[PDB]
Every structure is written in C-alpha cells, then in structure tokens.
Design a binder for this molecule. Structure first.
Ligand SMILES: [Zn+2]
Length: 30
C-alpha cells in the first residue's frame, strides 16, 4: 500500500495513521 512503515511492515491506510506510527517512539526519528 502507499503507506508502509519505514521499518516494520505495518501497512496503514492514510498519512494520518502512518504518521501515528512514526509519531510514537516507534523507530523513525530520521
Ligand atoms: Zn515501524
């Protein structure tokens, strides 16, 4: 999908959600 984590394979539906992943201390402060 046009929304795949920059690490995991957590495929979201929109930027808002995907951002929620990068938002938390997941792993993408870069
Ligand atoms: Zn991830």
């Amino acid at each position: 999908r046009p929304y795949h984590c920059s690490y995991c394979n957590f495929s979201f539906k929109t930027k808002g959600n995907l951002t929620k992943h990068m938002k938390s201390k997941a792993h993408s402060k870069k």
